[PDB]
Design a protein around this ligand. Structure first.
Ligand SMILES: C[C@@H]1C([C@H](C(=O)O)[C@@H](C)O)=N[C@H](C(=O)O)[C@H]1SC1Cn2cnc[n+]2C1
Ligand SMILES: [Cl-]
Ligand SMILES: [Cl-]
Ligand SMILES: [Cl-]
Ligand SMILES: [Zn+2]
Ligand SMILES: [Zn+2]
Ligand SMILES: [Zn+2]
Length: 231
C-alpha cells in the first residue's frame, strides 16, 4: 500500500505506518521538470512525536503538520534534518513557527547557511566523525561518512528495527544516480559499508525517495553509485 509518486498530488502529504510508533511521511515536489516523491520519518516519543526531515518545502511541510494532527494527534516537539538540502530542511521555518524545536548537525547548519537554505535552530553534538552515533529521543543518529552529501545522517529506530537512510540510500526502482553534485561518490560505498556493519539488525530500510525495503537497499545503492562513478 506504500504511496508512489503518481499517487500524491504536489502539496499533499501522506503517512504510512511502518511499525508500532513509526511512520514515514511522503510528499512530492516538482524539480528539474520532473515530479519526485520524498520520504521522511515520524517516531513516537512517549506522548510526543519526533520528526525526521521536512516534507520538501513550506507548503508541503504545513500539509505534513496538518496530516500528523489529523491522523496521529500527538504534538511534534522536535525535528531532525538529515542533511542540508531543501528536501530535508525546506520547511524548517514552518516547523519553527509551529513550535517545533528543529535540530541538525553543526555541519548541516553551516552548509545550509552557505547554500541559502533554512537553518535548523539547535546543533546536534557528537556526530562530526565517521562512525559516530548518538541517541536522540527514541532514535539513534549515525554519521556514516560522506555519501549523498558530506553531512548526511542516517536514523535508526531501535524499538522497531527501522533504518531511515535519507538520500544516502536509494530505492530499488532507481537504477541510476542523479543530483550528486554535492556527493562524495568515492566515499559513498565505504559509508554504506559502515551502515551495514552498524545496523545489521535493521528489518526495514527507508530511502530518502521511494519505496521502503529491506537491507538489500544498501547493496543496491552501492551498485548504482559505483556504476555512475564508472560511467
Ligand atoms: C532533487 C531531489 C533532492 C535534492 C537533494 O537533496 O539532492 C534537493 C532538492 O533536496 N534529493 C534528491 C535525491 O536524489 O536524494 C533528488 S530526487 C531523486 C532524483 N531522482 C531521479 N530518479 C529518481 N529520483 C529521486
Ligand atoms: Cl538544496
Ligand atoms: Cl527551539
Ligand atoms: Cl527546545
Ligand atoms: Zn540532498
Ligand atoms: Zn529549542
Ligand atoms: Zn533527496
Amino acid at each position: 500500500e506504500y504511496p508512489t509518486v503518481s499517487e500524491i498530488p504536489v502539496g499533499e502529504v501522506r503517512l504510512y505506518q511502518i511499525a508500532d510508533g513509526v511512520w514515514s511521511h511522503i510528499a512530492t515536489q516538482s524539480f528539474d521538470g520532473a515530479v519526485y516523491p520524498s520520504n521522511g520519518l515520524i517516531v513516537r516519543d512517549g506522548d510526543e512525536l519526533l520528526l525526521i526531515d521536512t516534507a520538501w518545502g513550506a507548503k508541503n511541510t504545513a500539509a505534513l503538520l496538518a496530516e500528523i494532527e489529523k491522523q496521529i494527534g500527538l504534538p511534534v516537539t522536535r525535528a531532525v534534518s538529515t542533511h542540508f538540502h531543501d528536501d530535508r530542511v525546506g520547511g524548517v521555518d514552518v516547523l519553527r513557527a509551529a513550535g517545533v524545536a528543529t535540530y541538525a548537525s553543526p555541519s548541516t547548519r553551516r552548509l545550509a547557511e552557505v547554500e541559502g537554505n533554512e537553518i535548523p535552530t539547535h546543533s546536534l553534538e557528537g556526530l562530526s566523525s565517521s562512525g559516530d552515533a548518538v541517541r536522540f529521543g527514541p532514535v539513534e543518529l549515525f554519521y556514516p561518512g560522506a555519501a549523498h552529501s558530506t553531512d548526511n545522517l542516517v536514523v535508526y529506530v531501535p524499538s522497531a528495527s527501522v533504518l531511515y537512510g535519507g538520500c544516502a540510500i536509494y530505492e530499488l526502482s532507481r537504477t541510476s544516480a542523479g543530483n550528486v553534485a554535492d556527493a562524495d561518490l568515492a566515499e559513498w560505498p565505504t559509508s554504506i559499508e559502515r551502515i551495514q556493519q552498524h545496523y545489521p539488525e535493521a528489518q526495514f530500510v527507508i530511502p530518502g525517495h521511494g519505496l521502503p525495503g529491506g537491507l538489500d537497499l544498501l547493496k543496491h545503492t552501492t551498485n548504482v553509485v559505483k556504476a555512475h562513478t564508472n560511467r
